[PDB]
Each structure stands twice: as C-alpha cells, then as structure tokens.
C-alpha cells in the first residue's frame, strides 16, 4: 500500500479525474504514466490525478524548499524570476554529484547586481549534512532553519523558499487522436503556405495552439508516421506536442505559448525592455533543446527565431521540429543552399544567424542585402558585422558557428555549455566555503 500527498491545489476537468487541495492525501492504486489511479483520503473518491501533483508521503519532494530533478542553470532562472527576493532559496539534486544536493540562495552583489550562488551540500555516511565541517546538521530542515536565523559563512542568509507556479497539467489520458469536435479554434494567428496556426480550446477547459494542414503530397500516414516519433522525443526546451487529429485535414495541437514567437516578442515592446544577460540567456534554451536534438542524432533544418516559441515566463521553446522533415534562405548554411546537405553542422549556423537574431532585436539578416546579393557574399568570404550592444565574446560564438567547413563548426553541447555560463568563470560555479 502506499500513500501520496497533494503539493497544490488541482480542479478536476475530465470525466473521472479528482478535485484535490494541497495537503490531501491518497492512495495509489496504478501507476499509468502521467495519470494515477487513486482514492481521496478527503473524499473517498476513486478516479485519476496528475502524478506531477503529488508525491511520496514525507520524501524530501513534499517540502516547500526542495526542488527535485532540477538543474543549476534552472535553479538560477528559477529563483531569479519574479516573485524571489533576496536571500530566497532551495535545496536540490546536485548535478554534478550524483545523489546528492545543493543549496542555491538568491544574493545580490554591488559590483553585477542580483545572482545566485550555490553551495554543495555535504554528506557520506554517518548520516547528517554539513556544508562547512564545524556545522553539522542531523537533517536537511534543521540545516535551512539555522541559515535562516543569520548567515554563517553564507554569501546571503536565507529568507523564504523559491516561488513557484502550479506544473503545467498532463495532458488528458489515452488522448493522442481526438476527434475534431472536442475543438473550437478561436483565432487564426498565422497562415502561411503549409497549414494555418490557430488558439482553439480542447474541451471548454483547456487553451491550445493548432496547426491545420494543407494536404500536400506528403502522405496521410507518412505524415502520422512522423508526428508519432515526434512525440516521444519529449523535452522542456520542445514545444509540448500533446495530440493530433487524424483525418484530413490534419490538425496538430501543441501547448500553448502565451508570448508567440521569439521574433514577435523581440519586436514587441516588451521585448526591446529585455538586457542582454536575458537575450543570452534565450539563446542558452535554444541551445540547450538543439543540444538535445544532436544528441539523438536529429536535425532541425529551420532554426530561426520564427520557429521559437516565448512563454508566459519568458521560457524558449523550439518549435517546429519535425515538421521541417515532412515539408528562407537568410538562416540556411552554404552546403545545404548549394547541394542540400543539411546536418546538425548546417543546424549550427543557422543557430547562428539566430544569436544575431537575439542580439539585435529581430532585424533580418543581412539587412538590405537580397537573398541573391547574400549567397554571393557568403562565397567571396563575407560575414555579418557586429552590431552594437553584442559583446565581443558572443560575436566570436557566431563567427565559430559560421565557419566554411562544416565540420569546425561547434557542437551544440558546447555552444550551449558556453552560453550558460556565459558570466561565471568556471572556478567560481560552486562557492568554496572554509
Ligand atoms: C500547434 O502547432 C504549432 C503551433 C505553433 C505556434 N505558433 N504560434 C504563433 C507564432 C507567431 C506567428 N506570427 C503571428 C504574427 N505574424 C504575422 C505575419 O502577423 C507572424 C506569425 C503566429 C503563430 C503560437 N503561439 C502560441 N502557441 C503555439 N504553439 C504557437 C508553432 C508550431 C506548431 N507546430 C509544431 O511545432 C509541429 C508541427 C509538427 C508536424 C509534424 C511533426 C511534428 C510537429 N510539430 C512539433
Ligand atoms: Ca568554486
């Protein structure tokens, strides 16, 4: 037998999933991927609940300062997010210390401004954690509650938890293929050559982006085919592809992503308020999700800013991926323009094309140059200019992503690595504490 505990308040909106509030316990009757089977100890009701809602009674999970599965760089994206404030904090898997944790505490720093710093936290057997060997700690609550009462040692004393936001709710179960009535798309965003983009609700309770297909000659099932890999290829830096509509018309349903695409907000006027530690930042999801993509021998073929979709956190997703398979040439890499060998090579220089994207606010490429204009360029030797605000470091990243040879070309899992810690010496990442 074994018993879960509610981390947030959740309303059900299907046919047999449960209404709980944060603290309800329940039993667990299957365990069925996203969706769990189980009985309210509240209510006494059978039915399903999002198992990203709850968590093993009393696991470290359930308190409000841990944060499980979580990176440094989200751990520093996180607590630097509106609603922190200084001395806010967590505790979490430690990334480069398998089983184990780190503190991250929210600090503020005359000579840069507002960071996050990370500590290690200590523990063999025995027991107990430490971060400093004079101070030993029997658990990790004991050891928040004593840096919360002063700072000893500690860059920042901790004040509250991290904030943080309900998880996205799973889609609904056993829903891959759904019949087109459960829709009622709203609003047409974008229309293009290839299908239309619209916001639809799935079901009264649920907004959702979706893209119609205009039957080409790309295949009914070939199509299907596609999608259904796609889907399993699941990443946080992917936009979520939650189902599809079989019959033509295909219809695609992705989450929905309340900012657009990157290019519309950086044009908007709330993108041209955004610092360049936030523009890098960006292009470090970007990055981190086609770091992904190269690791499972995948390809993008259309990187652009376009095809990055913005959060109402301001998180960056890819879009489009997979689709470029089943179906501008500013963003392309002059082996696949010329003989049309696009690889992960060609994905990196158009990654390229997209800092310079980022750093100058969504201006095309190659301004008052014509495409024609451009591929001669490219050939004679010719590369962008630096703009302005880009610092010097970052047009070298660009200028790497551009070299002729595809092959001396970086991989993304080094642009991403560089890109995160793109204000940190590698020697200052964790804080040494005496
Ligand atoms: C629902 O499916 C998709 C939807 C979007 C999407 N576009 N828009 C805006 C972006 C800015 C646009 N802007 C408006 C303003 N504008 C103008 C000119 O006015 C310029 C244009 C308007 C539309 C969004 N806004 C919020 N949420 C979203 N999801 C989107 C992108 C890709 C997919 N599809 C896939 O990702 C996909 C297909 C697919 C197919 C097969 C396999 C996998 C597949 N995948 C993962
Ligand atoms: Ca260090």
């Known amino acids: 037998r074994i018993i879960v505990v509610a981390l947030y308040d959740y309303e059900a909106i299907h046919h047999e999933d449960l209404s709980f509030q944060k603290g309800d316990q329940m039993v667990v009757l299957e365990e069925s991927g996203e969706w769990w089977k ?82 290690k936290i200590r523990t063999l057997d025995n027991g107990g954690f430490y971060i400093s060997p004079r101070s030993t700690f029997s658990t990790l609550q004991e050891l928040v509650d004593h840096y919360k009462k002063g700072n000893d040692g500690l860059c920042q004393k901790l004040s509250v938890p991290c904030m943080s936001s309900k998880p996205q709710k799973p889609w609904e179960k056993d829903a891959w293929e759904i019949p087109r009535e459960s829709l009622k798309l709203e609003k047409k965003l974008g229309a293009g050559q290839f299908g239309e983009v619209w916001m639809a609700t799935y079901n009264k309770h649920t907004k959702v982006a979706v893209k119609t297909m205009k039957p080409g000659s790309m295949s009914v099932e070939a199509f299907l085919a596609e999608a259904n890999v796609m889907k399993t290829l699941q990443h946080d830096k992917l936009v979520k592809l939650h189902a599809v509509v079989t019959k033509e018309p295909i219809y695609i349903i992705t989450e929905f992503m309340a900012k657009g695409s990157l290019l519309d907000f950086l044009k908007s006027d709330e993108g041209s308020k955004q610092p360049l530690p936030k523009l890098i930042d960006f292009s470090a999801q970007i990055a981190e999700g086609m770091a992904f993509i190269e690791q499972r021998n995948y390809i993008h073929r259309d990187l652009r800013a376009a095809n990055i979709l913005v959060s109402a956190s301001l998180v960056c997703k890819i879009a489009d991926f997979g689709l470029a398979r089943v179906i501008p040439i500013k963003w392309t890499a002059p082996e696949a323009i010329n003989f049309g060998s696009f690889t992960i090579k060609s994905d990196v220089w158009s990654f390229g094309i997209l800092l310079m994207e980022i750093v100058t606010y969504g201006r095309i490429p190659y301004p008052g140059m014509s495409n024609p204009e451009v591929i001669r360029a490219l050939e004679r030797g010719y590369r962008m200019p630096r703009p302005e605000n880009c610092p010097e470091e970052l047009y070298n990243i660009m200028m790497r992503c551009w070299k002729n040879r595809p092959e001396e070309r970086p991989t993304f899992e080094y642009i991403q690595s560089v890109l995160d810690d793109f204000y940190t010496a590698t020697e200052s990442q964790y804080e040494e504490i005496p």
């Open 38 to 119: 189980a009985r309210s100890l509240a209510t006494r009701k059978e039915g399903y609940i999002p198992s990203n809602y709850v968590a093993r009674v009393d696991s470290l999970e359930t308190e409000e300062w841990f944060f499980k599965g979580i990176s440094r760089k989200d751990a520093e994206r996180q607590l630097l997010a509106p609603g922190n404030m200084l001395g806010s904090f967590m505790i979490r898997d430690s990334e480069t210390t398998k089983g184990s944790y780190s503190l991250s505490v929210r600090d503020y720093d005359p000579r840069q401004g507002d960071t996050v710093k990370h500590y």
